[PDB]
mmCIF file of all heavy atoms in Angstrom:
data_model
loop_
_atom_site.group_PDB
_atom_site.id
_atom_site.type_symbol
_atom_site.label_atom_id
_atom_site.label_comp_id
_atom_site.label_asym_id
_atom_site.label_seq_id
_atom_site.Cartn_x
_atom_site.Cartn_y
_atom_site.Cartn_z
ATOM 1 N N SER A 1 0.773 -1.194 0.000
ATOM 2 C CA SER A 1 0.000 0.000 0.000
ATOM 3 C C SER A 1 0.836 1.291 0.000
ATOM 4 O O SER A 1 1.893 1.354 0.583
ATOM 5 C CB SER A 1 -0.925 0.098 1.220
ATOM 6 O OG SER A 1 -1.838 -1.009 1.262
ATOM 7 N N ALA A 2 0.283 2.325 -0.609
ATOM 8 C CA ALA A 2 0.696 3.699 -0.413
ATOM 9 C C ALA A 2 -0.204 4.298 0.635
ATOM 10 O O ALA A 2 -1.423 4.248 0.464
ATOM 11 C CB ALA A 2 0.603 4.458 -1.748
ATOM 12 N N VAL A 3 0.365 4.854 1.664
ATOM 13 C CA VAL A 3 -0.468 5.317 2.814
ATOM 14 C C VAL A 3 -0.162 6.754 3.108
ATOM 15 O O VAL A 3 0.991 7.095 3.383
ATOM 16 C CB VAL A 3 -0.202 4.400 4.098
ATOM 17 C CG1 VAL A 3 -1.259 4.701 5.147
ATOM 18 C CG2 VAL A 3 -0.229 2.881 3.758
ATOM 19 N N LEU A 4 -1.183 7.620 3.028
ATOM 20 C CA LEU A 4 -1.049 9.017 3.476
ATOM 21 C C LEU A 4 -1.226 9.050 4.976
ATOM 22 O O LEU A 4 -2.228 8.502 5.449
ATOM 23 C CB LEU A 4 -2.022 10.042 2.785
ATOM 24 C CG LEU A 4 -1.872 11.521 3.169
ATOM 25 C CD1 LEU A 4 -0.660 12.177 2.546
ATOM 26 C CD2 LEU A 4 -3.153 12.312 2.797
ATOM 27 N N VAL A 5 -0.252 9.654 5.650
ATOM 28 C CA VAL A 5 -0.302 9.670 7.108
ATOM 29 C C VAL A 5 0.023 11.045 7.678
ATOM 30 O O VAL A 5 0.705 11.876 7.060
ATOM 31 C CB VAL A 5 0.690 8.616 7.739
ATOM 32 C CG1 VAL A 5 0.403 7.214 7.299
ATOM 33 C CG2 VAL A 5 2.148 9.032 7.392
ATOM 34 N N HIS A 6 -0.467 11.264 8.922
ATOM 35 C CA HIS A 6 0.204 12.211 9.792
ATOM 36 C C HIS A 6 1.131 11.467 10.743
ATOM 37 O O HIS A 6 0.744 10.347 11.165
ATOM 38 C CB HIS A 6 -0.816 12.994 10.656
ATOM 39 C CG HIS A 6 -1.343 14.181 9.942
ATOM 40 N ND1 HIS A 6 -0.499 15.082 9.318
ATOM 41 C CD2 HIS A 6 -2.606 14.588 9.682
ATOM 42 C CE1 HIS A 6 -1.221 16.045 8.768
ATOM 43 N NE2 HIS A 6 -2.499 15.746 8.943
ATOM 44 N N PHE A 7 2.283 12.015 11.062
ATOM 45 C CA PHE A 7 3.119 11.328 12.054
ATOM 46 C C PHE A 7 3.991 12.285 12.808
ATOM 47 O O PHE A 7 4.288 13.401 12.370
ATOM 48 C CB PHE A 7 3.995 10.232 11.458
ATOM 49 C CG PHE A 7 5.175 10.704 10.695
ATOM 50 C CD1 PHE A 7 6.385 10.828 11.339
ATOM 51 C CD2 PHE A 7 5.142 10.999 9.361
ATOM 52 C CE1 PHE A 7 7.545 11.292 10.666
ATOM 53 C CE2 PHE A 7 6.235 11.456 8.666
ATOM 54 C CZ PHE A 7 7.474 11.604 9.281
ATOM 55 N N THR A 8 4.382 11.827 13.987
ATOM 56 C CA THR A 8 5.447 12.478 14.778
ATOM 57 C C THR A 8 6.443 11.424 15.168
ATOM 58 O O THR A 8 6.064 10.289 15.528
ATOM 59 C CB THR A 8 4.863 13.121 16.085
ATOM 60 O OG1 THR A 8 3.872 14.106 15.731
ATOM 61 C CG2 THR A 8 5.893 13.926 16.842
ATOM 62 N N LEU A 9 7.699 11.762 15.086
ATOM 63 C CA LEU A 9 8.737 10.794 15.458
ATOM 64 C C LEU A 9 9.605 11.476 16.516
ATOM 65 O O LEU A 9 10.144 12.606 16.270
ATOM 66 C CB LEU A 9 9.633 10.518 14.231
ATOM 67 C CG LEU A 9 10.736 9.539 14.141
ATOM 68 C CD1 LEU A 9 9.896 8.457 14.573
ATOM 69 C CD2 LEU A 9 11.124 9.224 12.725
ATOM 70 N N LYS A 10 9.606 10.936 17.719
ATOM 71 C CA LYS A 10 10.342 11.503 18.848
ATOM 72 C C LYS A 10 11.520 10.599 19.286
ATOM 73 O O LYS A 10 11.498 9.406 19.053
ATOM 74 C CB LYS A 10 9.441 11.722 20.058
ATOM 75 C CG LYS A 10 8.416 12.835 19.891
ATOM 76 C CD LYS A 10 7.677 13.006 21.170
ATOM 77 C CE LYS A 10 6.591 14.159 21.215
ATOM 78 N NZ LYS A 10 5.911 14.369 22.562
ATOM 79 N N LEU A 11 12.545 11.209 19.907
ATOM 80 C CA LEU A 11 13.705 10.524 20.447
ATOM 81 C C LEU A 11 13.502 10.283 21.930
ATOM 82 O O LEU A 11 12.568 10.825 22.547
ATOM 83 C CB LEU A 11 14.968 11.391 20.147
ATOM 84 C CG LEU A 11 15.136 11.691 18.651
ATOM 85 C CD1 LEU A 11 16.414 12.379 18.406
ATOM 86 C CD2 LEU A 11 15.005 10.399 17.786
ATOM 87 N N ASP A 12 14.384 9.461 22.534
ATOM 88 C CA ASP A 12 14.298 9.133 23.948
ATOM 89 C C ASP A 12 14.257 10.347 24.882
ATOM 90 O O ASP A 12 13.665 10.258 25.930
ATOM 91 C CB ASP A 12 15.541 8.312 24.361
ATOM 92 C CG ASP A 12 15.355 6.866 24.153
ATOM 93 O OD1 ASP A 12 14.252 6.348 23.815
ATOM 94 O OD2 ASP A 12 16.384 6.182 24.283
ATOM 95 N N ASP A 13 14.850 11.462 24.496
ATOM 96 C CA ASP A 13 14.835 12.674 25.310
ATOM 97 C C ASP A 13 13.525 13.504 25.174
ATOM 98 O O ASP A 13 13.347 14.515 25.850
ATOM 99 C CB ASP A 13 16.075 13.488 25.017
ATOM 100 C CG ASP A 13 16.091 14.004 23.652
ATOM 101 O OD1 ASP A 13 15.102 13.851 22.950
ATOM 102 O OD2 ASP A 13 17.127 14.567 23.231
ATOM 103 N N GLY A 14 12.607 13.020 24.346
ATOM 104 C CA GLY A 14 11.366 13.705 24.173
ATOM 105 C C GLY A 14 11.399 14.723 23.060
ATOM 106 O O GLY A 14 10.380 15.369 22.831
ATOM 107 N N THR A 15 12.503 14.907 22.349
ATOM 108 C CA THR A 15 12.485 15.851 21.258
ATOM 109 C C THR A 15 11.867 15.283 20.019
ATOM 110 O O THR A 15 11.882 14.105 19.764
ATOM 111 C CB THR A 15 13.853 16.454 20.814
ATOM 112 O OG1 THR A 15 14.711 15.428 20.378
ATOM 113 C CG2 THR A 15 14.501 17.195 21.950
ATOM 114 N N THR A 16 11.269 16.160 19.259
ATOM 115 C CA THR A 16 10.694 15.775 17.977
ATOM 116 C C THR A 16 11.667 15.782 16.800
ATOM 117 O O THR A 16 12.209 16.837 16.485
ATOM 118 C CB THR A 16 9.462 16.614 17.661
ATOM 119 O OG1 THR A 16 8.521 16.416 18.706
ATOM 120 C CG2 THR A 16 8.897 16.291 16.275
ATOM 121 N N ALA A 17 12.011 14.626 16.216
ATOM 122 C CA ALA A 17 12.947 14.571 15.125
ATOM 123 C C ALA A 17 12.283 14.975 13.819
ATOM 124 O O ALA A 17 12.879 15.615 13.013
ATOM 125 C CB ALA A 17 13.653 13.207 15.046
ATOM 126 N N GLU A 18 11.027 14.549 13.625
ATOM 127 C CA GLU A 18 10.318 14.759 12.361
ATOM 128 C C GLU A 18 8.873 14.747 12.681
ATOM 129 O O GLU A 18 8.403 14.031 13.524
ATOM 130 C CB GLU A 18 10.587 13.638 11.326
ATOM 131 C CG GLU A 18 12.052 13.419 10.755
ATOM 132 C CD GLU A 18 12.619 14.687 10.011
ATOM 133 O OE1 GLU A 18 11.783 15.424 9.418
ATOM 134 O OE2 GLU A 18 13.861 14.993 10.023
ATOM 135 N N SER A 19 8.095 15.578 12.039
ATOM 136 C CA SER A 19 6.628 15.634 12.213
ATOM 137 C C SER A 19 6.010 16.104 10.907
ATOM 138 O O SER A 19 6.551 17.015 10.273
ATOM 139 C CB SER A 19 6.284 16.705 13.306
ATOM 140 O OG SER A 19 4.914 16.904 13.547
ATOM 141 N N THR A 20 4.886 15.584 10.529
ATOM 142 C CA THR A 20 4.130 16.119 9.447
ATOM 143 C C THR A 20 3.594 17.520 9.749
ATOM 144 O O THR A 20 3.547 18.332 8.833
ATOM 145 C CB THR A 20 3.000 15.172 8.969
ATOM 146 O OG1 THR A 20 2.188 14.764 10.088
ATOM 147 C CG2 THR A 20 3.524 14.048 8.258
ATOM 148 N N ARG A 21 3.299 17.802 10.994
ATOM 149 C CA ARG A 21 2.987 19.204 11.416
ATOM 150 C C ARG A 21 4.063 20.213 11.034
ATOM 151 O O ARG A 21 3.740 21.270 10.444
ATOM 152 C CB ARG A 21 2.850 19.241 12.941
ATOM 153 C CG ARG A 21 2.319 20.533 13.456
ATOM 154 C CD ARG A 21 2.100 20.436 15.012
ATOM 155 N NE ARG A 21 0.957 19.608 15.423
ATOM 156 C CZ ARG A 21 1.037 18.373 16.002
ATOM 157 N NH1 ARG A 21 2.242 17.704 16.218
ATOM 158 N NH2 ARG A 21 -0.075 17.757 16.338
ATOM 159 N N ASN A 22 5.373 19.757 11.310
ATOM 160 C CA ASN A 22 6.552 20.571 11.115
ATOM 161 C C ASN A 22 6.758 20.719 9.614
ATOM 162 O O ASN A 22 7.113 21.855 9.111
ATOM 163 C CB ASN A 22 7.846 19.997 11.793
ATOM 164 C CG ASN A 22 9.081 20.869 11.516
ATOM 165 O OD1 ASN A 22 9.139 22.040 11.970
ATOM 166 N ND2 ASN A 22 10.028 20.343 10.742
ATOM 167 N N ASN A 23 6.521 19.656 8.858
ATOM 168 C CA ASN A 23 6.729 19.690 7.391
ATOM 169 C C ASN A 23 5.651 20.566 6.697
ATOM 170 O O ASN A 23 5.908 21.080 5.535
ATOM 171 C CB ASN A 23 6.664 18.295 6.820
ATOM 172 C CG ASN A 23 7.773 17.433 7.289
ATOM 173 O OD1 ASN A 23 8.806 17.926 7.756
ATOM 174 N ND2 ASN A 23 7.625 16.133 7.068
ATOM 175 N N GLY A 24 4.502 20.755 7.373
ATOM 176 C CA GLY A 24 3.449 21.508 6.718
ATOM 177 C C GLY A 24 2.434 20.641 5.986
ATOM 178 O O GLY A 24 1.458 21.210 5.470
ATOM 179 N N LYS A 25 2.604 19.292 5.875
ATOM 180 C CA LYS A 25 1.703 18.498 5.020
ATOM 181 C C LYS A 25 1.830 17.017 5.389
ATOM 182 O O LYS A 25 2.805 16.599 5.940
ATOM 183 C CB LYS A 25 1.993 18.665 3.521
ATOM 184 C CG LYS A 25 3.351 18.186 3.029
ATOM 185 C CD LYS A 25 4.429 19.234 2.934
ATOM 186 C CE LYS A 25 5.883 18.639 2.727
ATOM 187 N NZ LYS A 25 6.407 18.306 1.298
ATOM 188 N N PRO A 26 0.821 16.227 5.051
ATOM 189 C CA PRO A 26 0.948 14.746 5.298
ATOM 190 C C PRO A 26 2.037 14.109 4.529
ATOM 191 O O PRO A 26 2.494 14.653 3.498
ATOM 192 C CB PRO A 26 -0.406 14.239 4.864
ATOM 193 C CG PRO A 26 -1.292 15.535 4.618
ATOM 194 C CD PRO A 26 -0.441 16.627 4.402
ATOM 195 N N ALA A 27 2.435 12.944 4.991
ATOM 196 C CA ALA A 27 3.506 12.153 4.308
ATOM 197 C C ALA A 27 2.965 10.941 3.625
ATOM 198 O O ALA A 27 1.979 10.376 4.059
ATOM 199 C CB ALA A 27 4.589 11.757 5.317
ATOM 200 N N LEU A 28 3.588 10.566 2.560
ATOM 201 C CA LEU A 28 3.254 9.331 1.864
ATOM 202 C C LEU A 28 4.238 8.215 2.253
ATOM 203 O O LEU A 28 5.443 8.336 2.055
ATOM 204 C CB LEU A 28 3.290 9.570 0.347
ATOM 205 C CG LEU A 28 2.991 8.252 -0.402
ATOM 206 C CD1 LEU A 28 1.445 8.194 -0.338
ATOM 207 C CD2 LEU A 28 3.687 8.241 -1.814
ATOM 208 N N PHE A 29 3.757 7.181 2.898
ATOM 209 C CA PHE A 29 4.523 5.986 3.340
ATOM 210 C C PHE A 29 4.206 4.829 2.425
ATOM 211 O O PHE A 29 3.012 4.398 2.406
ATOM 212 C CB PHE A 29 4.117 5.535 4.759
ATOM 213 C CG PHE A 29 4.684 6.332 5.888
ATOM 214 C CD1 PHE A 29 5.496 7.469 5.703
ATOM 215 C CD2 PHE A 29 4.463 5.891 7.172
ATOM 216 C CE1 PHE A 29 5.976 8.209 6.776
ATOM 217 C CE2 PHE A 29 5.019 6.597 8.287
ATOM 218 C CZ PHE A 29 5.780 7.722 8.098
ATOM 219 N N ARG A 30 5.168 4.402 1.638
ATOM 220 C CA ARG A 30 4.933 3.318 0.708
ATOM 221 C C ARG A 30 5.516 2.009 1.241
ATOM 222 O O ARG A 30 6.726 1.933 1.455
ATOM 223 C CB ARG A 30 5.548 3.627 -0.653
ATOM 224 C CG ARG A 30 5.084 2.563 -1.601
ATOM 225 C CD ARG A 30 5.550 2.927 -3.006
ATOM 226 N NE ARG A 30 4.962 4.206 -3.479
ATOM 227 C CZ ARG A 30 3.767 4.232 -4.113
ATOM 228 N NH1 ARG A 30 3.015 3.120 -4.213
ATOM 229 N NH2 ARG A 30 3.280 5.365 -4.567
ATOM 230 N N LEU A 31 4.659 0.990 1.476
ATOM 231 C CA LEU A 31 5.124 -0.308 1.951
ATOM 232 C C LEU A 31 5.598 -1.113 0.729
ATOM 233 O O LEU A 31 5.078 -0.962 -0.382
ATOM 234 C CB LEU A 31 4.061 -1.142 2.702
ATOM 235 C CG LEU A 31 3.721 -0.648 4.074
ATOM 236 C CD1 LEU A 31 2.793 0.565 4.091
ATOM 237 C CD2 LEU A 31 3.119 -1.706 4.852
ATOM 238 N N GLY A 32 6.532 -2.008 1.013
ATOM 239 C CA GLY A 32 6.956 -3.027 0.054
ATOM 240 C C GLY A 32 7.989 -2.653 -0.923
ATOM 241 O O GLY A 32 8.274 -3.525 -1.804
ATOM 242 N N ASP A 33 8.677 -1.516 -0.750
ATOM 243 C CA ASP A 33 9.766 -1.175 -1.681
ATOM 244 C C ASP A 33 11.040 -0.801 -0.961
ATOM 245 O O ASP A 33 11.917 -0.113 -1.535
ATOM 246 C CB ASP A 33 9.294 -0.060 -2.588
ATOM 247 C CG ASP A 33 9.075 1.260 -1.887
ATOM 248 O OD1 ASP A 33 9.143 1.301 -0.658
ATOM 249 O OD2 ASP A 33 8.870 2.336 -2.585
ATOM 250 N N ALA A 34 11.172 -1.230 0.316
ATOM 251 C CA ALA A 34 12.356 -0.935 1.144
ATOM 252 C C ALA A 34 12.605 0.501 1.404
ATOM 253 O O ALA A 34 13.710 0.922 1.730
ATOM 254 C CB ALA A 34 13.634 -1.621 0.564
ATOM 255 N N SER A 35 11.575 1.342 1.258
ATOM 256 C CA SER A 35 11.659 2.758 1.689
ATOM 257 C C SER A 35 11.368 2.973 3.152
ATOM 258 O O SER A 35 11.793 3.992 3.694
ATOM 259 C CB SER A 35 10.784 3.685 0.839
ATOM 260 O OG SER A 35 9.412 3.317 1.038
ATOM 261 N N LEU A 36 10.690 2.021 3.780
ATOM 262 C CA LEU A 36 10.360 1.985 5.200
ATOM 263 C C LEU A 36 11.044 0.845 5.801
ATOM 264 O O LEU A 36 11.203 -0.183 5.182
ATOM 265 C CB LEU A 36 8.834 1.799 5.402
ATOM 266 C CG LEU A 36 7.944 2.831 4.723
ATOM 267 C CD1 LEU A 36 6.471 2.384 4.880
ATOM 268 C CD2 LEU A 36 8.148 4.231 5.107
ATOM 269 N N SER A 37 11.368 0.942 7.088
ATOM 270 C CA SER A 37 11.934 -0.287 7.718
ATOM 271 C C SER A 37 10.888 -1.356 7.865
ATOM 272 O O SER A 37 9.699 -1.062 7.948
ATOM 273 C CB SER A 37 12.577 -0.015 9.062
ATOM 274 O OG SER A 37 11.572 0.286 10.040
ATOM 275 N N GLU A 38 11.316 -2.626 7.902
ATOM 276 C CA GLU A 38 10.369 -3.673 8.111
ATOM 277 C C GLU A 38 9.645 -3.478 9.453
ATOM 278 O O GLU A 38 8.523 -3.807 9.536
ATOM 279 C CB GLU A 38 10.950 -5.095 7.894
ATOM 280 C CG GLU A 38 11.104 -5.439 6.399
ATOM 281 C CD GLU A 38 11.636 -6.871 6.201
ATOM 282 O OE1 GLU A 38 12.789 -7.088 6.592
ATOM 283 O OE2 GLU A 38 10.849 -7.716 5.704
#
């Protein structure tokens, strides 16, 4: 699947590494082509 998502990705210290909020728009996560970790 191609999946449109909102996401936030935080580190152990509580900081935000990446967010769709921060980017300004949703992200497209494509399964099955090694663009995402298993």
Side-chain angles (χ1 to χ4, degrees):
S1 301
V3 192
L4 183 75
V5 301
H6 274 311
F7 75 93
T8 300
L9 185 54
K10 290 184 178 184
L11 304 186
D12 272 353
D13 66 7
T15 61
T16 301
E18 296 300 329
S19 178
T20 52
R21 190 175 287 108
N22 178 65
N23 294 340
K25 64 265 167 86
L28 178 81
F29 282 3
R30 188 174 298 272
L31 287 77
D33 68 352
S35 64
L36 304 173
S37 71
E38 283 182 294

